[PDB]
Amino acid sequence: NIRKIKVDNMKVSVYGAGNQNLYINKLNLPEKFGGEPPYGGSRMAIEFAEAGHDVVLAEPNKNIMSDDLWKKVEDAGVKVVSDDVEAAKHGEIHVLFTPFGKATFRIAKTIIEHVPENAVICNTCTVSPVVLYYSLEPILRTKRKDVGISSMHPAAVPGTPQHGHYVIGGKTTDGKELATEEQIKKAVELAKSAGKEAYVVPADVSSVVADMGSLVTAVALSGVLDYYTVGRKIINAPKKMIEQQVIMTLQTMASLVETSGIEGMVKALNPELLIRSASSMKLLDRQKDLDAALEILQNLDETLKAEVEKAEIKPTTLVAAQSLVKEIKTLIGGAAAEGAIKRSARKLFEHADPNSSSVDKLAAALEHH
Amino acid sequence: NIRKIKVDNMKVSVYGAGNQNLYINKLNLPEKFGGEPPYGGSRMAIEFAEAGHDVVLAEPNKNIMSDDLWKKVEDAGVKVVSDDVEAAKHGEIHVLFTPFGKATFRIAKTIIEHVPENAVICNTCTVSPVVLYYSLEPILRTKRKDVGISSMHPAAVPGTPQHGHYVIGGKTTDGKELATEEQIKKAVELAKSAGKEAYVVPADVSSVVADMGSLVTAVALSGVLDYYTVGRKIINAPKKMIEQQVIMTLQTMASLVETSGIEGMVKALNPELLIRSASSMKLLDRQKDLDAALEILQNLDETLKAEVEKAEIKPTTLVAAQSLVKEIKTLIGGAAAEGAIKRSARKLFEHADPNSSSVDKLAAALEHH
Ligand SMILES: [Cl-]
Ligand SMILES: [Cl-]
Ligand SMILES: [Mg+2]
Ligand SMILES: [Mg+2]
Ligand code: NA
Ligand code: NA
Numbered sequence: 001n002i003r004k005i006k007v008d009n010m011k012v013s014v015y016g017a018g019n020q021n022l023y024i025n026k027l028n029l030p031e032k033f034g035g036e037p038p039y040g041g042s043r044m045a046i047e048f049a050e051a052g053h054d055v056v057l058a059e060p061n062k063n064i065m066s067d068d069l070w071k072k073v074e075d076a077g078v079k080v081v082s083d084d085v086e087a088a089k090h091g092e093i094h095v096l097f098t099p100f101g102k103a104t105f106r107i108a109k110t111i112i113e114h115v116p117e118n119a120v121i122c123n124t125c126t127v128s129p130v131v132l133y134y135s136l137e138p139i140l141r142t143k144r145k146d147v148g149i150s151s152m153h154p155a156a157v158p159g160t161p162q163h164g165h166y167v168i169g170g171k172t173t174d175g176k177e178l179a180t181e182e183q184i185k186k187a188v189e190l191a192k193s194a195g196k197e198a199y200v201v202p203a204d205v206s207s208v209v210a211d212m213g214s215l216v217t218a219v220a221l222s223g224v225l226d227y228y229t230v231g232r233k234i235i236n237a238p239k240k241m242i243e244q245q246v247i248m249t250l251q252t253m254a255s256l257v258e259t260s261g262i263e264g265m266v267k268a269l270n271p272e273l274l275i276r277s278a279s280s281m282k283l284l285d286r287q288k289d290l291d292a293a294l295e296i297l298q299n300l301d302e303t304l305k306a307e308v309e310k311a312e313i314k315p316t317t318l319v320a321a322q323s324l325v326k327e328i329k330t331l332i333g334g335a336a337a338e339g340a341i342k343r344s345a346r347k348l349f350e351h352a353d354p355n356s357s358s359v360d361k362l363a364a365a366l367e368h369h
Numbered sequence: 370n371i372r373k374i375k376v377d378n379m380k381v382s383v384y385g386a387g388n389q390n391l392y393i394n395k396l397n398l399p400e401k402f403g404g405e406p407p408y409g410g411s412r413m414a415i416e417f418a419e420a421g422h423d424v425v426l427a428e429p430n431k432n433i434m435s436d437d438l439w440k441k442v443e444d445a446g447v448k449v450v451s452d453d454v455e456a457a458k459h460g461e462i463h464v465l466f467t468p469f470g471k472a473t474f475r476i477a478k479t480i481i482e483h484v485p486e487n488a489v490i491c492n493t494c495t496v497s498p499v500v501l502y503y504s505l506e507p508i509l510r511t512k513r514k515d516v517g518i519s520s521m522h523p524a525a526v527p528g529t530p531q532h533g534h535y536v537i538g539g540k541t542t543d544g545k546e547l548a549t550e551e552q553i554k555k556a557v558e559l560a561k562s563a564g565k566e567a568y569v570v571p572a573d574v575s576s577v578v579a580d581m582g583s584l585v586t587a588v589a590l591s592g593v594l595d596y597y598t599v600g601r602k603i604i605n606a607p608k609k610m611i612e613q614q615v616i617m618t619l620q621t622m623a624s625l626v627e628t629s630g631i632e633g634m635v636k637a638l639n640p641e642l643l644i645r646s647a648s649s650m651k652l653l654d655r656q657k658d659l660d661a662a663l664e665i666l667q668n669l670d671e672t673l674k675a676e677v678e679k680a681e682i683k684p685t686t687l688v689a690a691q692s693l694v695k696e697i698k699t700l701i702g703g704a705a706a707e708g709a710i711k712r713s714a715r716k717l718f719e720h721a722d723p724n725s726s727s728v729d730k731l732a733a734a735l736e737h738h
């Protein structure tokens with residue numbers, strides 16, 4: 001353990017101290033969840049320095065944290081810098097605890113130019129590893145073939161008792177390696193050296209189980225498993241029938257949200273009807289997920305009916321996504337198909353809109369002359 | 370009400386008496402849910418005859434119900450026949466309480482040839498209205514432009530107290546009319562005349578809220594609404610961010626099931642990790658859906674780990690379906706795009722495999738000579 005850490009002790013660079021006002025004031029984590037500030041990136045840095053690593057924390061904004069919190073960071077042995085280039089030249093592992101949007105991609109492009117050989121660039125919850133890879137792909141493929149992309153996603157707020165793990169993005173479900181095994185193993189080593197359980201998951205799936213949306217994934221998964229058990233044990237429906245129903249429902253809901261938002265999706269799937277319909281699926285003594293859902297739909301039903309009749313169901317073409325991917329790959333086949341897929345994959349995983357806001361364009365024009 | 374029924378009293382044809390052994394013995398509905406046999410199609414026929422309509426029930430298999438149950442049907446005033454053609458020539462509304470697979474499409478093709486002018490053909494849970502329309506489309510477009518497609522989906526087992534409603538398929542989310550307003554209004558009239566609440570929903574969505582999969586839809590919907598409320602009230606995340614997370618999660622889960630089944634999907638989305646990750650989303654005093662899900666995942670976790678390591682994550686290309694539909698419509702655009710979409714829509718909604726089983730081909734070859 002300690003003897004092993006000495007052999008594998010490495011240089012680590014964390015980018016982004018974490019928005020402490022968000023953690024302490026808006027979320028009130030010390031009272032709601034536990035622990036003590038700082039939280040986030042600066043906390044990950046403290047934990048890695050506490051584990052014996054040479055940690056550099058790159059934060060350009062000194063006012064994001066009070067001076068007392070900064071001392072906690074400095075007292076841990078973390079070297080704070082304001083220049084990303086200084087931190088890029090340092091680590092062999094770079095954790096992006098950076099803001100949603102342009103900032104994460106801008107910093108990733110700045111560091112890939114100065115990272116040491118075989119370094120790995122790790123995302124957190126503000127970006128998907130797939131989208132991070134797509135943005136650095138031209139450099140990764142030609143200039144830096146040695147650089148790897150993975151995750152060091154806390155899937156929790158570092159500094160809270162809930163943070164006892166890390167999600168590390170591995171080979172994708174489409175069989176694509178964004179990083180070498182050695183680089184992924186080094187990410188696992190870093191995680192475990194800070195007393196955190198290391199979870200290596202397909203990179204494309206990491207966001208789905210690590211981000212705030214994991215709430216929807218957990219709930220929906222329990223519904224799928226409840227239905228799967230009822231379907232096979234009580235209904236004795238064939239597995240392919242149960243699978244067809246699961247895909248049909250989950251895919252319809254995603255696509256309605258995609259075109260018409262949550263409100264429009266609720267307008268298409270009537271909660272009142274769903275309560276009545278799903279009630280004939282109460283076939284077991286304990287279906288706590290179904291009972292909880294029906295009461296939630298029932299309680300929210302009166303309030304929902306108001307805004308949903310204001311909502312609009314925008315044109316939706318409900319299709320089975322993988323089946324449609326397979327068809328374009330045979331109808332079109334090649335590079336044209338690759339582009340249409342990469343763009344649809346990016347639309348699914350992009351956390352922030354890549355295009356500049358109307359104000360940004362107007363502000364730039366105001367300062368033009 | 371009664372005076373109104375006399376003006377709108379109409380001829381009704383129900384196809385399929387309902388598998389009584391399933392309802393009474395395998396499901397034991399009299400004791401588990403309530404009511405008295407018969408259930409299903411023959412019950413829908415009784416209720417429609419009880420409402421004053423001239424009902425014909427077409428059932429080729431007399432042994433599907435005991436003689437006492439048949440008397441209940443005959444005593445209601447329902448004319449039982451064994452020839453579908455005799456019932457097709459009768460009603461102006463045809464309800465398909467037929468078996469999963471080939472049988473439903475075969476009967477629908479037999480009746481469209483003899484249905485009276487302006488008749489409407491209604492599906493139940495064994496077929497999707499979209500797939501039913503696709504199978505009769507060449508005849509509907511050329512010979513019978515007057516015929517309409519809709520649903521008379523009980524979204525419950527007729528004969529149980531839970532059956533107090535009907536889902537009637539209306540214009541699709543893609544803005545397509547499978548039936549005229551008058552035909553849909555007649556379906557609503559038939560439903561309401563039997564004391565049932567009429568729910569008109571987009572035809573493509575009807576299965577998602579009416580079928581056994583409504584269990585998954587209800588649960589997942591409560592998870593989405595829980596996350597939506599937490600996201601906006603506690604996290605104060607923008608709506609587009611909440612929407613992105615909802616789509617990303619629901620679409621990933623559907624696609625994993627599509628390529629790798631439930632087991633493979635559970636192998637990709639680690640339940641143990643999800644429990645830990647989703648626990649940092651317990652931001653409100655009451656989140657009964659999340660708490661129920663975490664205990665279900667926790668209880669099922671030990672059992673799942675056994676078969677999931679046996680499971681395989683088959684190649685999956687995660688993309689946002691609607692975004693990918695929009696791209697093929699501009700890259701390809703025309704008829705080629707229509708075909709690829711109609712086929713992907715059919716794969717999503719088809720309840721049974723359209724292709725003949727290996728045994729069927731082998732049996733046919735055995736009786737060839
Ligand atoms: Cl230098
Ligand atoms: Cl005749
Ligand atoms: Mg919305
Ligand atoms: Mg399976
Ligand atoms: Na930079
Ligand atoms: Na027939």
